[PDB]
Design a protein around this ligand. Structure first.
Ligand SMILES: C[C@]12CCc3c(ccc4cc(O)ccc34)[C@@H]1CCC2=O
Ligand SMILES: C[C@]12CCc3c(ccc4cc(O)ccc34)[C@@H]1CCC2=O
Lengths: 120, 123
């Protein structure tokens, strides 16, 4: 079983690589067979493309509370903000990571609905 | 598909029911065949869910949603605190819960996610 310390550090590395625009660094956290979701995309190529599309605009990302890490899972509340064509948007999801035995993320699901997308 | 408004209302109603010690009001949110799981198997069906919540309600709880609900498709996730005190010693737990809903708008599964670092000794 993964340690909560390890899963928590991975969530912080994920947030860090988003803020730095470090696409390599994001993908390196995932397993070769991981899926991502927010069409559920799978495998390294599809994952890289998912994140490359997100990172067409510079993202400001912040964990807004402590991470919840248990068993082989972590859930975390956060914001992701971007500014383009004179408009700032702040999206407030909750993300859930599942991890494999080797400590890599095998699934991420970002949960948010319309009321969690704020155009201020 | 469920509305996000309905799901969000249900999360709020769940919080309120916990604060009011309203056991039947909590159980009424769930489908007949729902599962609960917290942090060696899920509890399944009405009697087991009732027993799960009756045991939680042995101490007075103060539950607060600490951020907006996330609701989408047939699911909702939410951040909150649960605060209780036993023999003068206070605990604040900070979980994230996830509900799945059936087509009738009842909860078919609740998972509560929290670890040791999410259990805070002291008020
Ligand atoms: C997908 C994502 C969460 C949601 C999200 C992101 C980026 C831009 C978005 C734009 C939206 O209109 C709605 C959601 C997002 C994040 C980038 C990393 C991540 O976890
Ligand atoms: C199970 C629960 C979330 C976690 C939790 C509750 C109550 C007492 C707790 C005590 C703990 O040491 C750890 C977690 C809980 C809530 C009751 C309602 C709910 O969803």
């Amino acid at each position: 079983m993964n340690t909560p310390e390890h899963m928590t550090a991975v969530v912080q590395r994920y947030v860090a690589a988003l803020n730095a625009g470090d696409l390599d660094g994001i993908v390196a956290l995932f397993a070769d067979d991981a899926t991502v979701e927010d069409e559920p995309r799978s495998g390294t190529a599809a994952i890289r493309e998912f994140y490359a599309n997100s990172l067409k605009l510079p993202l400001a990302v912040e964990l807004t509370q402590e991470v919840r890490a248990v068993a082989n899972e972590a859930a975390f509340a956060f914001t992701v903000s971007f500014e383009y064509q004179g408009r700032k948007t702040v999206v407030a999801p909750i993300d859930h990571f599942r991890f494999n035995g080797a400590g890599k993320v095998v699934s991420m699901r970002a949960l948010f609905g319309e009321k969690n997308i704020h155009a201020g």
